[PDB]
């Protein structure tokens, strides 16, 4: 089971902009999760080949990871905060869909998601 192309991080005809909320998503939210002890499984797309997960991309049809999110934020790929928040939620949800309750990877996602929720709670008002 081969890996798919990763999610796009560049698309010239996609409308995009910088907002103060998107800056916060990079400087606070992504930075916080990225430095966490449990970040590493989430720092790049799932390599189904090297991880011996041949069913991964038969089950997970909307893959997402923080490597992709990081690049999207660095490239100002998003139009608004909700697009980026949705990417984080997709990443967490994928983990819970694919894996079993109590698996190490799920505990790791749960810890990252708690921090995500704490930071998004203080998302600044736009502009
Ligand atoms: O579901 C996801 C999203 C991100 C990676 N991932 C996933 C699911 C199932 C196995 C693996 N393989 S692994 O990277 O070597 C691994 C990583 C952390 C762990 F705690 C354990 Cl027990 C194994 C990865």
GROMACS .gro file of C-alpha atoms and ligand atoms in nm:
model
  151
    1UNK     CA    1   0.000   0.000   0.000
    2UNK     CA    2   0.165   0.314  -0.135
    3UNK     CA    3   0.145   0.660   0.018
    4UNK     CA    4  -0.077   0.923  -0.148
    5UNK     CA    5   0.061   1.262  -0.244
    6UNK     CA    6   0.052   1.480   0.067
    7UNK     CA    7  -0.210   1.748   0.111
    8UNK     CA    8  -0.131   2.058  -0.088
    9UNK     CA    9   0.045   2.344   0.084
   10UNK     CA   10   0.060   2.577  -0.216
   11UNK     CA   11  -0.212   2.671  -0.468
   12UNK     CA   12  -0.180   3.003  -0.646
   13UNK     CA   13  -0.541   3.049  -0.748
   14UNK     CA   14  -0.670   2.969  -0.397
   15UNK     CA   15  -0.776   3.287  -0.220
   16UNK     CA   16  -0.569   3.345   0.089
   17UNK     CA   17  -0.488   3.614   0.339
   18UNK     CA   18  -0.317   3.698   0.662
   19UNK     CA   19  -0.536   3.764   0.963
   20UNK     CA   20  -0.443   3.827   1.326
   21UNK     CA   21  -0.622   3.501   1.410
   22UNK     CA   22  -0.410   3.307   1.161
   23UNK     CA   23  -0.096   3.470   1.305
   24UNK     CA   24  -0.205   3.344   1.648
   25UNK     CA   25  -0.265   2.996   1.506
   26UNK     CA   26   0.100   2.992   1.394
   27UNK     CA   27   0.274   3.178   1.677
   28UNK     CA   28   0.078   3.028   1.966
   29UNK     CA   29  -0.125   2.721   1.866
   30UNK     CA   30   0.100   2.542   1.618
   31UNK     CA   31   0.418   2.641   1.809
   32UNK     CA   32   0.276   2.503   2.135
   33UNK     CA   33   0.176   2.169   1.991
   34UNK     CA   34   0.487   2.131   1.776
   35UNK     CA   35   0.727   2.151   2.072
   36UNK     CA   36   0.532   1.900   2.282
   37UNK     CA   37   0.697   1.566   2.378
   38UNK     CA   38   0.411   1.389   2.196
   39UNK     CA   39   0.428   1.593   1.874
   40UNK     CA   40   0.654   1.368   1.670
   41UNK     CA   41   0.394   1.123   1.525
   42UNK     CA   42   0.199   1.426   1.402
   43UNK     CA   43   0.482   1.633   1.252
   44UNK     CA   44   0.452   1.483   0.902
   45UNK     CA   45   0.204   1.285   0.693
   46UNK     CA   46   0.149   0.927   0.802
   47UNK     CA   47   0.396   0.705   0.617
   48UNK     CA   48   0.177   0.398   0.580
   49UNK     CA   49   0.461   0.208   0.418
   50UNK     CA   50   0.731   0.258   0.680
   51UNK     CA   51   0.480   0.224   0.965
   52UNK     CA   52   0.334  -0.095   0.813
   53UNK     CA   53  -0.021   0.041   0.805
   54UNK     CA   54  -0.138  -0.080   0.462
   55UNK     CA   55  -0.503  -0.002   0.549
   56UNK     CA   56  -0.440   0.355   0.669
   57UNK     CA   57  -0.533   0.539   0.349
   58UNK     CA   58  -0.818   0.299   0.277
   59UNK     CA   59  -0.975   0.415   0.607
   60UNK     CA   60  -0.854   0.776   0.636
   61UNK     CA   61  -0.968   0.965   0.327
   62UNK     CA   62  -0.897   1.316   0.457
   63UNK     CA   63  -0.542   1.289   0.599
   64UNK     CA   64  -0.392   1.580   0.789
   65UNK     CA   65  -0.085   1.642   0.999
   66UNK     CA   66   0.096   1.933   1.165
   67UNK     CA   67   0.375   1.932   0.907
   68UNK     CA   68   0.116   2.019   0.649
   69UNK     CA   69  -0.050   2.272   0.877
   70UNK     CA   70   0.290   2.431   0.957
   71UNK     CA   71   0.368   2.472   0.587
   72UNK     CA   72   0.019   2.605   0.515
   73UNK     CA   73   0.059   2.867   0.787
   74UNK     CA   74   0.412   2.957   0.678
   75UNK     CA   75   0.287   2.989   0.318
   76UNK     CA   76  -0.022   3.190   0.419
   77UNK     CA   77  -0.233   2.925   0.245
   78UNK     CA   78  -0.550   2.986   0.446
   79UNK     CA   79  -0.832   3.234   0.397
   80UNK     CA   80  -0.948   3.223   0.758
   81UNK     CA   81  -0.892   3.072   1.102
   82UNK     CA   82  -1.173   2.822   1.064
   83UNK     CA   83  -0.992   2.652   0.774
   84UNK     CA   84  -0.686   2.597   0.991
   85UNK     CA   85  -0.888   2.494   1.298
   86UNK     CA   86  -1.063   2.238   1.077
   87UNK     CA   87  -0.725   2.095   0.973
   88UNK     CA   88  -0.629   2.041   1.340
   89UNK     CA   89  -0.962   1.880   1.415
   90UNK     CA   90  -0.930   1.655   1.110
   91UNK     CA   91  -0.587   1.541   1.235
   92UNK     CA   92  -0.721   1.452   1.580
   93UNK     CA   93  -1.035   1.286   1.447
   94UNK     CA   94  -0.836   1.072   1.203
   95UNK     CA   95  -0.630   0.944   1.492
   96UNK     CA   96  -0.939   0.849   1.690
   97UNK     CA   97  -1.102   0.686   1.387
   98UNK     CA   98  -0.803   0.475   1.289
   99UNK     CA   99  -0.675   0.370   1.632
  100UNK     CA  100  -0.824   0.205   1.943
  101UNK     CA  101  -0.921   0.381   2.268
  102UNK     CA  102  -0.623   0.373   2.504
  103UNK     CA  103  -0.361   0.318   2.230
  104UNK     CA  104  -0.045   0.523   2.296
  105UNK     CA  105  -0.103   0.727   1.980
  106UNK     CA  106  -0.453   0.814   2.106
  107UNK     CA  107  -0.320   0.923   2.447
  108UNK     CA  108  -0.072   1.141   2.259
  109UNK     CA  109  -0.343   1.298   2.042
  110UNK     CA  110  -0.556   1.358   2.352
  111UNK     CA  111  -0.275   1.548   2.524
  112UNK     CA  112  -0.212   1.763   2.216
  113UNK     CA  113  -0.585   1.821   2.168
  114UNK     CA  114  -0.626   1.941   2.529
  115UNK     CA  115  -0.361   2.210   2.462
  116UNK     CA  116  -0.517   2.293   2.129
  117UNK     CA  117  -0.850   2.353   2.301
  118UNK     CA  118  -0.688   2.567   2.571
  119UNK     CA  119  -0.520   2.785   2.311
  120UNK     CA  120  -0.816   2.813   2.075
  121UNK     CA  121  -1.024   2.925   2.372
  122UNK     CA  122  -0.816   3.244   2.366
  123UNK     CA  123  -0.830   3.303   1.990
  124UNK     CA  124  -0.826   3.680   1.944
  125UNK     CA  125  -1.114   3.872   1.794
  126UNK     CA  126  -1.047   3.936   1.424
  127UNK     CA  127  -0.857   4.250   1.316
  128LIG     O1  128  -0.269   0.745   1.355
  128LIG     C1  129  -0.157   0.802   1.346
  128LIG     C2  130  -0.146   0.946   1.321
  128LIG     C3  131   0.004   0.977   1.343
  128LIG     C4  132   0.072   0.839   1.341
  128LIG     N1  133  -0.035   0.743   1.357
  128LIG     C5  134  -0.008   0.609   1.380
  128LIG     C6  135  -0.105   0.510   1.408
  128LIG     C7  136  -0.069   0.376   1.430
  128LIG     C8  137   0.066   0.338   1.425
  128LIG     C9  138   0.165   0.434   1.397
  128LIG     N2  139   0.297   0.397   1.392
  128LIG     S1  140   0.420   0.478   1.481
  128LIG     O2  141   0.437   0.629   1.430
  128LIG     O3  142   0.558   0.400   1.467
  128LIG    C10  143   0.369   0.500   1.649
  128LIG    C11  144   0.368   0.633   1.695
  128LIG    C12  145   0.330   0.663   1.826
  128LIG    C13  146   0.293   0.559   1.911
  128LIG     F1  147   0.259   0.593   2.032
  128LIG    C14  148   0.294   0.425   1.867
  128LIG    CL1  149   0.247   0.302   1.974
  128LIG    C15  150   0.333   0.394   1.735
  128LIG    C16  151   0.127   0.568   1.376
   0.00000   0.00000   0.00000
